[PDB]
């Protein structure tokens, strides 16, 4: 490692992932009840196991909602179809523990209050974080993670590599170069990926293709050398897979969710949660303020801290760290974001357009970085 | 916000908060296992809804474990002993979802394999910090949450206020001046307090109870000030509380586990796993490495990095950011770190002590920075 130069790992994984199974059976819940009714209140954990999807938490909503269908319709198009898979949307177990809001959160939070100014639904910290040193502003080592996941399923619903299953995992460490703050790529030291298998190819089989069609398929040729180490199937046997290899819960790939160990994170899961929960919420606004002060040229690179109390609409405080990446001072930075931004939930909401129902889009390859989402549009700054 | 000083926040909850009871749990299942068979493998999920703990997950074991009674006796250690409080340990329903650990991921990381050899449980990427700030190396945001909420257990347990209940959450937002890559505690910026009550009390009595006999009681004068913002009760009501006004999973406070959103976290939950799962194994070594750093007087702020692959012993790479606090370079640290530290899970278990059954004392308040733990007694550097 030269002077100046370091590594940095993130990690992905796929959308059969047990864990991700549930973040997009929530967020699936979510966009159901939305679909009739945009002020839904939903607070739905999935957890799974084998030959189970369990929900549970706190629904209040006038949609009337097939949970049968919506659950299991989101498992199929996952991929897990058959029992030799090792689960099926057709046959499995789905259970039902759903409550109402809590009277007592919706009174504190909602009830008899203008949009606006409801309160957040929890107290709690988020962050946002952007660098440019990718076009859509994230880290590389989480977004080739990512891309791997991906590549994967293309090649399994695609029918090239038809022994793939859809749980997977990847993760990329690269090296970077320090850069007046900003950070650049250098090259990819080392990439893991393993992803479950039926019974019948052999691991040299899975071994040449996972570096042959999946790695040179998506990192480009330039970061990869003679040095570089691949962990390619390194358990050896990955047949049994998704929930039945490893129980999966909503909101336990939080990092994957964000920044690969970027920046920072308060902790709070976003996925089964309408928009009065800042977890979700004030996280996009955070990653919205962070992208727009970096493709605005004030950044190259960028981290915010926001923070609320339950029941109180303003964020508590608010604070930019600019990586010595901008001209300005934080104080100025801060002025910048406190005349362009308005964090309260009830003014999220309206700016991300948080009633509609994308939100089982977000809950596989990351929230961030993708698809020009709202929070993904820079706001054109007035200062 | 003076130049060269900012805000950060960090948050805490309690021991009867829904998510803190699941990790309490699988921790109390782990600890039980261990106290038959220092060998068992355990991956325990616990959900928490109203009336219902669910198991969920993989464990192999030669222990003979009655898990209605390990559930039970935790809850009652919580203090969820009566349908009035909103759970009783008495009277809830537990459900157990539990297989054996899968084979192929047995095969894969631990049989036949010498224990020093043993494989990663899993990849992943993991942290370890530490901040001279305190005498303990944790940030103060986080050590005063935790205090608040365990000020309020004492006053609950001790019948001082015979209203408050299990379920708590708290935050605490400081002022801090830059100090050569160290950072320095100004004063308190705000506090928020929510917490679970009975019936009979009114909110005005609540809030001064919080002020005078909680925060008092916990966070130096010097700190506090005419301009220090109290959100105590936010929501008003609190009286729906516990798995009843919100689901509770394992795993869903990793911020509050850690570093309080300081540092970074790489996304892996610690509570219901044995020492094979990286992910707290690995993050505890972490802490120990970081902690051994600025004890020694090498550092007086760290930031650690290191990751795995499923099956493979020793980390994939590791890397220290010393936030300009060493006079010792990058390289140069890291070279005292592999001299002095061997990160395969099968030797961080003899280094730790990680088979005895200690873990349901991590599983609130944090576990990083209290009691003394293995990894909380900085080894003696060599260079
Ligand atoms: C003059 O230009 C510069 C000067 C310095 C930087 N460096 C140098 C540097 C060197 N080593 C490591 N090793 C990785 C570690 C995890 C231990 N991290 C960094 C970080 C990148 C992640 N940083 C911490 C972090 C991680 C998550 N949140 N924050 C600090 C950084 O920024 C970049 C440009
Ligand atoms: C010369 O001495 C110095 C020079 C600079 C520092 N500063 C100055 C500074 C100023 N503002 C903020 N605002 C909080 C933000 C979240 C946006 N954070 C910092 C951090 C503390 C948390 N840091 C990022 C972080 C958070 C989690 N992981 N990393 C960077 C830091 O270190 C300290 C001593
Ligand atoms: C390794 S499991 C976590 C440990 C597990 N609960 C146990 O009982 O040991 C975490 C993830 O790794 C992946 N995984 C499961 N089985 C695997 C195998 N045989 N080889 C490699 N990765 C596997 C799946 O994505 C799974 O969700
Ligand atoms: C606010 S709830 C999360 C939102 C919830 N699932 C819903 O349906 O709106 C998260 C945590 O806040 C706390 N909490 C629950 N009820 C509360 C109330 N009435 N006032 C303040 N905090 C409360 C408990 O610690 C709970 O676990
Ligand atoms: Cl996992
Ligand atoms: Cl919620
Ligand atoms: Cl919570
Ligand atoms: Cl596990």
């Given at each position: 490692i030269e002077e100046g130069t370091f590594l940095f790992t993130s990690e992905s994984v796929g959308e059969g992932h047990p864990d991700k199974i549930c973040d997009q059976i929530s967020d699936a819940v979510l966009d159901a009840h939305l679909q009739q009714d945009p002020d839904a209140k939903v607070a739905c954990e999935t957890v799974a196991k084998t030959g189970m999807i369990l929900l549970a938490g706190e629904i209040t909503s006038r949609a009337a909602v097939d949970y049968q269908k919506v659950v299991r319709?989101?498992?199929?198009?996952?991929?897990?179809?058959?029992?030799?898979?090792?689960?099926?949307?057709?046959?499995c177990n789905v259970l039902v523990a759903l409550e109402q809001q809590s009277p007592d959160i919706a009174q504190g939070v909602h009830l008899d209050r203008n949009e606006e100014d409801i309160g957040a639904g929890d107290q709690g910290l988020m962050f946002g974080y952007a660098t440019d040193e990718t076009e859509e502003c994230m880290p590389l080592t989480i977004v080739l993670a990512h891309k791997?996941?991906?590549?994967?399923?293309?090649?399994?619903?695609?029918?090239?590599?038809?022994?793939?299953?859809?749980?997977?995992?990847?993760?990329?460490?690269?090296?970077?170069?320090?850069?007046?703050?900003?950070?650049?790529?250098?090259?990819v030291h080392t990439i893991v990926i393993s992803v479950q298998h039926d019974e019948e190819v052999c691991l040299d089989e899975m071994r040449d293709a996972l570096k042959?069609?999946?790695?040179?398929?998506?990192?480009?040729?330039?970061?990869?050398?003679?040095?570089?180490?691949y962990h390619l199937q390194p358990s050896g046997r990955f047949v049994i897979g998704g929930?039945?290899?490893?129980?999966?819960?909503?909101?336990?790939?939080?990092?994957?969710?964000?920044?690969?160990?970027?920046?920072?994170?308060?902790?709070?899961?976003?996925?089964g949660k309408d928009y009065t929960k800042?977890?979700?919420?004030?996280?996009?606004?955070?990653?919205?303020?962070?992208?727009?002060?970096?493709?605005?040229?004030?950044?190259?690179?960028?981290?915010?801290?926001?923070?609320?109390?339950?029941?109180?609409?303003?964020?508590?405080?608010?604070?930019?760290?600019?990586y010595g990446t901008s001209q300005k001072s934080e104080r100025e930075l801060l002025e910048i974001v406190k005349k362009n931004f308005d964090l309260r939930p009830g003014v999220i909401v309206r700016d991300?357009?948080?009633?509609?129902?994308?939100?089982?889009?977000?809950?596989?390859?990351?929230?961030?970085?993708?698809?020009?989402?709202?929070?993904?549009?820079?706001?054109?700054?007035?200062?």
């Amino acid at each position: 490692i030269e002077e100046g130069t370091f590594l940095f790992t993130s990690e992905s994984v796929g959308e059969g992932h047990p864990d991700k199974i549930c973040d997009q059976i929530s967020d699936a819940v979510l966009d159901a009840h939305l679909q009739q009714d945009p002020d839904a209140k939903v607070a739905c954990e999935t957890v799974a196991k084998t030959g189970m999807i369990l929900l549970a938490g706190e629904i209040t909503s006038r949609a009337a909602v097939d949970y049968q269908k919506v659950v299991r319709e989101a498992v199929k198009h996952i991929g897990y179809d058959d029992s030799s898979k090792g689960f099926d949307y057709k046959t499995c177990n789905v259970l039902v523990a759903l409550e109402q809001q809590s009277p007592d959160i919706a009174q504190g939070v909602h009830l008899d209050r203008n949009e606006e100014d409801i309160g957040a639904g929890d107290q709690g910290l988020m962050f946002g974080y952007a660098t440019d040193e990718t076009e859509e502003c994230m880290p590389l080592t989480i977004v080739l993670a990512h891309k791997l996941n991906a590549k994967l399923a293309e090649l399994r619903r695609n029918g090239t590599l038809p022994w793939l299953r859809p749980d997977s995992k990847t993760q990329v460490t690269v090296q970077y170069m320090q850069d007046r703050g900003a950070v650049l790529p250098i090259r990819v030291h080392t990439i893991v990926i393993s992803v479950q298998h039926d019974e019948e190819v052999c691991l040299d089989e899975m071994r040449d293709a996972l570096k042959e069609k999946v790695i040179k398929a998506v990192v480009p040729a330039k970061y990869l050398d003679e040095d570089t180490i691949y962990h390619l199937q390194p358990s050896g046997r990955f047949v049994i897979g998704g929930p039945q290899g490893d129980a999966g819960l909503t909101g336990r790939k939080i990092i994957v969710d964000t920044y690969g160990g970027w920046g920072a994170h308060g902790g709070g899961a976003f996925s089964g949660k309408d928009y009065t929960k800042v977890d979700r919420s004030a996280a996009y606004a955070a990653r919205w303020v962070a992208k727009s002060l970096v493709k605005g040229g004030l950044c190259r690179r960028v981290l915010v801290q926001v923070s609320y109390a339950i029941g109180v609409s303003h964020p508590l405080s608010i604070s930019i760290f600019h990586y010595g990446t901008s001209q300005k001072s934080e104080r100025e930075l801060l002025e910048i974001v406190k005349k362009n931004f308005d964090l309260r939930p009830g003014v999220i909401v309206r700016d991300l357009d948080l009633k509609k129902p994308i939100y089982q889009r977000t809950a596989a390859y990351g929230h961030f970085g993708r698809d020009s989402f709202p929070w993904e549009v820079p706001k054109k700054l007035k200062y």
